[PDB]
Ligand binder design. Structure first.
Ligand SMILES: *[C@@H]1O[C@H](CO)[C@@H](O)[C@H](O)[C@H]1NC(C)=O
Ligand SMILES: *[C@@H]1O[C@H](CO)[C@@H](O)[C@H](O)[C@H]1NC(C)=O
Ligand SMILES: *[C@@H]1O[C@H](CO)[C@@H](O)[C@H](O)[C@H]1NC(C)=O
Ligand SMILES: *[C@@H]1O[C@H](CO)[C@@H](O)[C@H](O)[C@H]1NC(C)=O
Ligand SMILES: *[C@@H]1O[C@H](CO)[C@@H](O)[C@H](O)[C@H]1NC(C)=O
Lengths: 99, 172, 44, 49, 50
């Protein structure tokens, strides 16, 4: 609606018989692949990200934000547990740090 | 093909040019409408050969390689469900049905392979289960609901697609 | 050629063979040379 | 051509107005397109027709 | 020629693979929208008769 990308803001300018909107938007770039997991089995319980995704570079598992690669160690503060992990399709084993 | 009538019309003004200009503008804006609606993305994404979307079945909406204009099953049903001198000419549209089908297939592939990320820039692949978890979180329902009801939700989606198929096939 | 308007001295150059002078819309604008201007009019 | 939409609107308006002005100089089947000429050349009945 | 709809690229889809961006760009674009047209009035009597 306000430009291609994630709209940040816009500025109006006049014209002879109309208006010109300068739309400032955020466009992600410099992609990189990772391996994901819907949840994490720890102590026989499934952990899901509070806000973000579980990714692994090659060996380690972090929880990052969706729109920007900012990996962080998985913790009980940035994940929430919901039942055992015999039902989630594609759950992965890992340790959830307890601070 | 009447010289007398043509001569009479000459001295009647320039209404013919106005009418032709109006009709030309109408045709141009029709082409613009189709282009604006269907040409949102300028990259023709292709669906992968392995179709593992967490149990969801899009075969009814994805293009069929049987080449019935390379239109999906529902697209063929829709196309078969619509029943279509004196200087009156019908101009062909700029975009053919095949190209429009290509655009729709690209949009479908982008949606099912990368979610909304392909509309804000470069398409970012993501498992369809995780994309649906994103959307469930978007409507205010946590992710665990999906990840625990994945099979049920996939079955319900497939049943809904089948019901749409039946409604378009039989019901008029 | 009948008309109503204001006659003024014209800076335009009529060649010896030219009598009338028309602007766009094919309405007489000058006559042999005097420019013709419609009498002041408008809305109220 | 960065302001094509605005320029197109202006062009449409100007072209319609110019078409009207040009249409102001058509006979439509009359002896002449100049009302003054008709009045000065004809008497009431055929003048009004 | 026959117009091309765009570059054809297949997304590397996999059931356990995601693509995350590491950088961003601040893109400024321009959208031009007409808002008015010339206000013209016509004296019908003068135009028809003069
Ligand atoms: C990484 O992702 C790109 C597309 O984003 C894909 O072409 C490439 O194959 C992926 N890496 C591997 C090792 O497949
Ligand atoms: C993954 O990240 C961890 C921590 O940042 C690092 O120790 C490890 O070497 C990385 N592995 C690869 C393959 O990049
Ligand atoms: C992904 O698909 C592969 C087969 O291509 C399968 O072995 C694996 O278990 C699947 N993983 C998930 C999380 O669906
Ligand atoms: C995760 O660990 C449990 C026990 O700790 C084990 O039964 C299960 O097989 C492991 N998952 C995988 C994918 O190996
Ligand atoms: C992001 O891009 C800018 C230039 O556009 C560059 O200077 C910067 O180093 C990049 N950052 C990363 C993390 O790649």
């Amino acid at each position: 609606f306000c430009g291609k990308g994630y709209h940040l803001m816009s500025f109006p300018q006049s014209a002879p018989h109309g208006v010109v909107f300068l739309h400032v938007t955020y466009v992600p770039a410099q992609e990189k692949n990772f391996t994901t997991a819907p949840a994490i089995c720890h102590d026989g319980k499934a952990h899901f990200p509070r806000e973000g995704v579980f990714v692994s570079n090659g060996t380690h598992w972090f929880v990052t934000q969706r729109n920007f690669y900012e990996p962080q160690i998985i913790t009980t503060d940035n994940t929430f547990v919901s039942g055992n992990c015999d039902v989630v399709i594609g759950i992965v084993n890992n340790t959830v740090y307890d601070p | 093909d009447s010289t007398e009538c043509s001569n009479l019309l000459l001295q009647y003004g320039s209404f013919c040019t106005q009418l032709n200009r109006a009709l030309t503008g109408i045709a141009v804006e029709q082409d613009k409408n189709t282009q604006e609606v269907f040409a949102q993305v300028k990259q023709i994404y292709k669906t992968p050969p392995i179709k593992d979307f967490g149990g969801f079945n899009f075969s009814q909406i994805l293009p069929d390689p049987s080449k019935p204009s390379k239109r999906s099953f529902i697209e063929d049903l829709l196309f078969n469900k619509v029943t279509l001198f004196n200087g009156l000419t019908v101009l062909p549209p700029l975009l053919t049905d095949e190209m429009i089908a290509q655009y729709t297939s690209a949009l479908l592939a982008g949606t099912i392979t990368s979610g909304w990320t392909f509309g804000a820039g470069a398409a970012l692949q993501i498992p369809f289960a995780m994309q649906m978890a994103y959307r469930f979180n978007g409507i205010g329902v946590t992710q665990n609901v999906l990840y625990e009801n994945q099979k049920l939700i996939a079955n319900q989606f497939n049943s809904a697609i089948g019901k749409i198929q039946d409604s378009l096939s039989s019901t008029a | 050629l009948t008309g109503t308007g204001v006659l003024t001295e014209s800076n335009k150059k009529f060649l010896p063979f030219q009598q009338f002078g028309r602007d766009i819309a094919d309405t007489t604008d000058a006559v042999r040379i005097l420019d013709i201007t419609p009498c002041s009019f408008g809305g109220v | 051509s960065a302001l094509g939409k605005l320029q197109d609107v202006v062009n449409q308006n100007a072209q319609a107005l110019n078409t009207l002005v040009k249409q102001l100089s058509s006979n439509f089947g009359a002896i002449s397109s100049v009302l003054n000429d008709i009045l000065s050349r004809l008497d009431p009945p055929e003048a009004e027709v | 020629y026959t117009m091309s709809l765009g570059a054809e690229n297949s997304v590397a889809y996999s059931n356990n693979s995601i693509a995350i961006p590491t950088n961003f760009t601040i893109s400024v674009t321009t959208e031009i929208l007409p808002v008015s047209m010339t206000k013209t009035s016509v004296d019908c009597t003068m135009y028809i008769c003069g």
